[PDB]
Design a protein around this ligand. Structure first.
Ligand SMILES: NS(=O)(=O)c1nnc(NC(=O)[C@]23C[C@H]4C[C@H](C[C@H](C4)C2)C3)s1
Ligand SMILES: [Zn+2]
Length: 257
């Protein structure tokens, strides 16, 4: 089964998921001098006031926080998007050292980690149907750099000890994801894919220009998680990022000059 190691990592995924070599794969390097400002792009609308978080879970490739998506409660609209996209979950990708960990890069620069808030287009009724559509999902990507602590991340960090190994979950209600956002909603956008299997080409990517800062103590707690299940040889969950893929016939648009 797939992972991030030498024998099951990103260079192997195409054998089970041939779309790994497809025409709109993610992540990509964002070349800031080639991205074009698009004045027709509307402001992003992030409406998280009624978000209802449910659980936090170690799924063997990251940890994720899941939300109630049975109603319009936490939604993303505007920007490049048509219609309403409901927040399903967020998760992170991170590195073994501070100089790597992000999936998207900016002028080849790698950040220490990357937060992905995963949303799906309500016109398709459920997320499984949405993943089969070219406009089915919208992922809001936020870079993390190491510096001052991010207070809105601390409640997450606090609970990671309880989900150390694959399969573990914990109650994670009343979490406000607005605490994970930077000040600015300036963004780049391009059509892409899921960055883990099945690698489906169903995502409108919205990558925020402004990173959030997290403390060294916060990211160190990410690095104490395990890929393995309890009772198996301990393999630290680090470097769970897919590298940049070919841009091919795609243009990255910027919301800002
Ligand atoms: N790293 S990223 O944000 O591009 C993501 N890469 N893969 C992701 N997968 C999902 O989000 C799913 C949401 C539900 C349906 C598909 C089957 C399970 C269930 C998970 C997809 S997000
Ligand atoms: Zn992701």
């Amino acid at each position: 089964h797939w992972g991030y190691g030498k024998h099951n990592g990103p260079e192997h995924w195409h054998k089970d998921f041939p779309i790994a070599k497809g025409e709109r794969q993610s992540p990509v390097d964002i070349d800031t001098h080639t991205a074009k400002y698009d004045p027709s792009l509307k402001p992003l609308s992030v409406s998280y006031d009624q978000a209802t978080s449910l659980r936090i879970l170690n799924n063997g490739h990251s940890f994720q926080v899941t939300f109630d998506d049975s109603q319009d409660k936490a939604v993303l609209k505007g920007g490049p998007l048509d219609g309403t996209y409901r927040l399903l979950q967020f998760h992170f990708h991170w590195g073994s050292l501070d100089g790597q960990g992000s999936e998207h890069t900016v002028d080849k620069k790698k950040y220490a980690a990357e937060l992905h808030l995963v949303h799906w287009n309500t016109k398709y009724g459920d997320v499984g149907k949405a993943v089969q559509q070219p406009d089915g999902l919208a992922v809001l990507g936020i870079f993390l750099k190491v510096g001052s602590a991010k207070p809105g991340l601390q409640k997450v960090v606090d609970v990671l000890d309880s989900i150390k190994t694959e399969g573990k979950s914990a109650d994670f209600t009343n979490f406000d994801p607005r605490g994970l956002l930077p000040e600015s909603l300036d963004y780049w956008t391009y059509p892409g894919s899921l960055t883990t299997p099945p690698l489906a080409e169903c995502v409108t990517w919205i990558v925020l220009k402004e990173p959030i800062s997290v403390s060294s103590e916060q990211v160190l707690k990410f690095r104490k998680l395990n890929f393995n299940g309890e009772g198996e040889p301990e393999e630290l969950m680090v470097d769970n990022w897919r590298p940049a893929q070919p841009l091919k016939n795609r243009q990255i648009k910027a919301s800002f000059k």
